[model samples]
Target: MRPSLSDYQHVASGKVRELYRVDDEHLLFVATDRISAFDFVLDTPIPDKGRILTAMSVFFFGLLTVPNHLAGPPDDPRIPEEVLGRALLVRRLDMLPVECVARGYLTGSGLLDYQRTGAVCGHVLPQGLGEASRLDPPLFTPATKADIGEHDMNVDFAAVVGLVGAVRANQLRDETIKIYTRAAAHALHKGIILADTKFEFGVDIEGNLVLADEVFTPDSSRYWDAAHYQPGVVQDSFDKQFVRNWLTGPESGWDRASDTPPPPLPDEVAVATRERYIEAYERISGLSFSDWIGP
Candidate 1:
């Protein structure tokens, strides 16, 4: 028998995921098929996209050897078959109001920030860094978690210490860097670059720090194909390559900088994107997608 979920409320929702209460001690982090771009949820759904990301998260959580938010196994009985493989049963936590980010390369928002400023999260770097350049020793760039549809504000380590108190804040930074070191190394061995990823932390009943939210999935991490490596310019991505390419093409008629939302994806685009996601999973994990089934 499983615990009842009649009282669960959808307390929050990110772009492609939702958090539902399952009593005061647990949450259902349900990943949907929705995809977002240009800071807006597009009017398109990538079929099986949620399941693919869920698998990616589970793969990392299993390998990381850290205390994460997982409350039960993927096939636990509490998981309903309807959303089985895509919905994770996680411990409800007083999630830390911090977006713990780690980067081993200079790109994306970090590159933009470095271009304007000399440092990232207050760590000064050597001058004359180019796009997609590897960041030596990596960085723990903490940001404040924002509300739905809002951007997370980046802050320095001193600010984090002030917010979470000196000791606890130091612990977050240390753990985040360690996580990045391990994950980035693994990604490199797998022929991809784990540029930067964000993590959310929450407290357990005994006031212990526990990793919350998804791990280094493509949605949370920027991964580039290492085979076609090039510096001075941002390399094309390995994940979401198909979807992004299609959106920028003439057929989509979508101006990326426009405030308007993108239209639905074409059939070919959608199919190609789905296949790319599954292919990414297989290439990274050596696990066949056909072997995975929803609870």
Candidate 2:
């Protein structure tokens, strides 16, 4: 049996992650091997998945040079041995009510919204664009941070202003685009296409809006294999697309609209997903997964 990690007063849990209070000044932010597809936390987990995500986030947190909420190292003493490689000691902040999303490519909900109204989040696009089409200047598509098991609702810029007031909303929108532009360039250099990404920000005690939660990891971003990308179809990806594809595919014998939990993934699907996560980390960071801090 896995040893019980001493309780530090578990604080919150997300679809595939968790947080625990370590002290008044810090919190333990942990990533897990569990994977989610179509917002459903699946029954299967990919091996080494947690470590890969942690490594990916740390890589960007180091590279981005933005004010963030990390308070300790990857192997910080407060982390339990069971979660060493997958947990970070972070300073907690008053997380903002907005979900900061940026998109460089038209896909996912943005595509659907465009198909319906020829625009996304109030930005009307050129009418001819279709799936996977590039959004040259990129778009800052902010959303509401949803409660557990709920879908994040995409909102217009005016809606964002109503939630956080105009000034902060504008700042969030611009910064979201700036980060996406910079990260997308870096990914292109590494031969990957960062389609779209989401970031969570929080206000620190000093009143500065700091980047919080994970950034640009597969779960937070849609990464496509650059070499295989085609504008009219869904490109192969390094994120949870494999699981999503399988769960919705005929072979899985699954009905996505059945109001039932998804079936467990096949061993092969789990393995493939594990490899994709590792590839994403390694390809973007230019570091070997074996060199990561923990198992």
Query: lDDT scores for all predictions?
Result: 0.83, 0.87
The TM-score, computed over Cα atoms with residue i paired to residue i, of candidate 1 is 0.94
Candidate 2 per-residue lDDT, tens place, 119-225, comes to 89999899899989999889988888566667788999999899888999988998889888888999889989999999999988887889989988988999888
Pairs with backbone N, CA or C atoms under 3 Å apart (clashes), candidate 1: none
lDDT of 1 by residue, 88-109 (tens): 8899777788889998888877
Q: What is the C-alpha local distance difference test score of candidate 2?
A: 0.87
Candidate 1 Cα errors over 4 Å, as ranges: 1-7
> How many backbone clashes does every candidate have?
0, 0
